[PDB]
Structure 1
Amino acid sequence: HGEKSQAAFMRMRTIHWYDLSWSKEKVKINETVEIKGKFHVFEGWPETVDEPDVAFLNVGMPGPVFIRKESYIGGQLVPRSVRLEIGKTYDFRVVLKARRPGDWHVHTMMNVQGGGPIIGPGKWITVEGSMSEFRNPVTTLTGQTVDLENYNEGNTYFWHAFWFAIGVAWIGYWSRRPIFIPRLLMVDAGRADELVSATDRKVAMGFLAATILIVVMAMSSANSKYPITIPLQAGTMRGMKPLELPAPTVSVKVEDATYRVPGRAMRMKLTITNHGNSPIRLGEFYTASVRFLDSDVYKDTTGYPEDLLAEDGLSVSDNSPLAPGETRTVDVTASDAAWEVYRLSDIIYDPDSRFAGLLFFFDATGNRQVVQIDAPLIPSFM
């Protein structure tokens, strides 16, 4: 829910999420929903954002309405921050367990150490049941199975209440006698040296000795119980395995790209050159979580969120099949209400009027190619 407020150009050129899939749309408490897909780190990473040398695969949700059971970059679990390489494509997978009933907008996001959150597309997921049914069991290496919902809760409550009671007892011992005005007047009028007299010093010595003794004894007792402990596990994980994508056989040059102010459309002129040996057709333009589709070429069957999906939002002046070896120039219009709803038109406010996106080309046999485009985006007012 944090997008629509970030700069449009930086939403356009940080990370491109595609091939997203959600295993379920409606789940019960304790059930699992799996979010998969790929993300590409844009080569033209903005200078105001630190390079994703330290990045965390997070989930966008209103608090722990789900718990993150697992998360993978590549094929390996990533509970710590990771190092990503600019220009690479990674596949990810997040496993969530439903915890709180309701309708939640779940995003896949990436946090970068020096640039803030990069929020991917959000999908509404319904959770049914009761929060009282949620369980989070975990088996330790010491041979004990505990529930993370309430483990150590009583111990924490007890120790905090005990020390609070000790402090309250100290203050109350001193508060049985008159507190402020008589003591102030006694300290002012000559030496006081009467408001603190034995056995006050004995009581203070007892409090100090009892505090130190209780701390030492409690530490020793908490070492006998739980004799095996480890420090908090932390540290960025290098060696994230990226996807080894084949080199695209389509080359696209953005010769001038504009947009109307005001308006809900973006227009660009592309020179597409088709290498390889199969006729291709432009089927999709993805800019920032928004997919503009040409319905005559490609249809979405993955249940992409409807507000981010423009089924016929991509119009190509000449979208006839492009024979191999042939190059042509077309005018491409990406038009949808999403362009204004997600404030992609707010790029006119940005200090860097440049866009980036992904074009998906499909051949007759159905196999698709991903090409990346970026160009200056010029507003037009007249």
Structure 2
Amino acid sequence: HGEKSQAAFMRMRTIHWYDLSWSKEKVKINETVEIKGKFHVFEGWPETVDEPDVAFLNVGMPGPVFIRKESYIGGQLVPRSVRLEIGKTYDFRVVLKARRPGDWHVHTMMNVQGGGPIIGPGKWITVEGSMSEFRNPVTTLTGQTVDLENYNEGNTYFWHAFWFAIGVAWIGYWSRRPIFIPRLLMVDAGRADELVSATDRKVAMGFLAATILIVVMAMSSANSKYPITIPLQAGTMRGMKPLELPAPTVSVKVEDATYRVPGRAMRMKLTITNHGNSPIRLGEFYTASVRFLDSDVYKDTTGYPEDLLAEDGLSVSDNSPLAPGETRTVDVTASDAAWEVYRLSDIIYDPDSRFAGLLFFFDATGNRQVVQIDAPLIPSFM
């Protein structure tokens, strides 16, 4: 939720989430679900989004219905912000632990500092159980196992209720006398200096004494009960390891890409050149969380979200195998209701009518090439 109101050219041209997995789609309380995958940072990053020099790998969910146990970019734990490089592919893994029962729409997202959230595809995951059984144990370096669901809760309640009671006693010492307008009349008509007794000054210096005294004795007792404390640990971790990929043996050039206004399909003319050693076929076009597949070439077996999966949404006009060294110009239609549901047709309202995406080519064996395409997208009305 939240992705359909973002700009369609911003969704097409920031992050490409592919190879995504979900270890479970139905889970119990205190049980973990893992989300692995790869994300590519697009080379033509938009100027209206700030560059991902301070990015945070986040999870989209309606509040903590799962807790994030772990996050890894590469194979390295990332509890802080990271610096990602434009053009690089990274490998991520997020381990979540189920907290609230229901049916939740979980996204993988990236929070960029001057660009907000970049939301990936979301899966409905069902949590069964009751929230009372949720435990969040952690073990401190001082040798103590606490439960983070209720740790430091009675202490917080005590120290806020105490100071609220002291403030209410300070107001209520002065609100047992006539509050408004014997005193308004007493100040301007002379006697403003008999509205305050000497007993009132005794009580005020008692409050000022045993407020500072209570604060310093409470700080001393907190320092004695918790001798070992560290600061809050923050800082952007640069030095993320990009996924090192072989160069693709397929080169694709987009001649022109159009789309009907209104409609549910976009069109492309592609010049495809196989510089490999095996015949390729085009099996998938991924543009902005939506996967258009050719059924004769590729079938999805990772349980992708069905609202974002066009399992026969790719129509290639000549999808015979492409021999090595052979070049072919071909017409490719990407057609699904998710074009209109996820508001990719709302690129007509964007000040930059260009698209980006990934094409997936498959050999006769099953070896996959990932080609990154990018072109102007021209609307069609007449």
TM-score, normalised to structure 2's length? Answer: 1.00
Cα displacement (A) at 1:98: 0.3
Q: Does 1:218 align with 2:218?
A: yes
Deviations 1:305-327 (A, max 9, x none): 00000000000000000000000
For residues 224 and 208 of structure 2, what CA distance do their matches in structure 1 show?
A: 25
Cα displacement (A) at 1:181: 1.1
For residues 140 and 293 of structure 1, what CA distance do their matches in structure 2 show?
A: 49
Alignment of 1:215-364 (within 5 A): 215-364=215-364
Cα displacement (A) at 1:146: 0.2
Deviations 1:141-180 (A, max 9, x none): 0000000000000000000000000000011011111111
1:175 is paired with a residue whose SS is: coil
Deviations 1:168-202 (A, max 9, x none): 00110111111111111111111321110111000
1:16 is paired with a residue whose SS is: strand
Cα displacement (A) at 1:243: 0.2
For residues 17 and 29 of structure 2, what CA distance do their matches in structure 1 show?
A: 28
Deviations 1:278-310 (A, max 9, x none): 000000000000000000000000000000000
- Aligned twin of 2:76: 76
For residues 279 and 367 of structure 2, what CA distance do their matches in structure 1 show?
A: 11
For residues 343 and 177 of structure 2, what CA distance do their matches in structure 1 show?
A: 66
1:364 is paired with a residue whose SS is: coil
Cα displacement (A) at 1:254: 0.2
Deviations 1:323-372 (A, max 9, x none): 00000100000000000000000000100000000000000000100000
For residues 378 and 250 of structure 2, what CA distance do their matches in structure 1 show?
A: 25
- Aligned twin of 2:119: 119
1:159 is paired with a residue whose SS is: helix
Cα displacement (A) at 1:46: 0.3
For residues 205 and 6 of structure 1, what CA distance do their matches in structure 2 show?
A: 58
1:185 is paired with a residue whose SS is: helix
1:121 is paired with a residue whose SS is: strand
2:182 is paired with a residue whose SS is: helix
The total of aligned residue pairs comes to 382
Question: C-alpha root-mean-square deviation of aligned residues, in Å?
Answer: 0.4
For residues 75 and 118 of structure 1, what CA distance do their matches in structure 2 show?
A: 22
For residues 117 and 377 of structure 2, what CA distance do their matches in structure 1 show?
A: 24
For residues 21 and 102 of structure 1, what CA distance do their matches in structure 2 show?
A: 21
1:179 is paired with a residue whose SS is: coil
Structure 2: state its 5+ residue gaps: none
Deviations 1:81-135 (A, max 9, x none): 0000000000100000000000000000001011111000000000000001100
Alignment of 1:168-183 (within 5 A): 168-183=168-183
Deviations 1:46-104 (A, max 9, x none): 01111100000000000000000000000011000000000000010000000000000
1:181 is paired with a residue whose SS is: coil
1:40 is paired with a residue whose SS is: strand
1:50 is paired with a residue whose SS is: coil
Q: 191-200 or 244-253: which moved more?
A: 191-200
1:24 is paired with a residue whose SS is: coil
TM-score, normalised to structure 1's length? Answer: 1.00
For residues 264 and 287 of structure 1, what CA distance do their matches in structure 2 show?
A: 14
For residues 8 and 138 of structure 1, what CA distance do their matches in structure 2 show?
A: 42
For residues 36 and 198 of structure 2, what CA distance do their matches in structure 1 show?
A: 71
For residues 192 and 13 of structure 2, what CA distance do their matches in structure 1 show?
A: 72
For residues 277 and 78 of structure 1, what CA distance do their matches in structure 2 show?
A: 39
Q: After the TM superposition, which parts of structure 1 deviate over 6 Å for at least 4 consecutive aligned residues?
A: none
For residues 20 and 222 of structure 1, what CA distance do their matches in structure 2 show?
A: 47
Deviations 1:194-253 (A, max 9, x none): 110111000000000000000000000000001000010000000000000000000000
For residues 116 and 148 of structure 1, what CA distance do their matches in structure 2 show?
A: 29
Structure 1: state its 5+ residue gaps: none
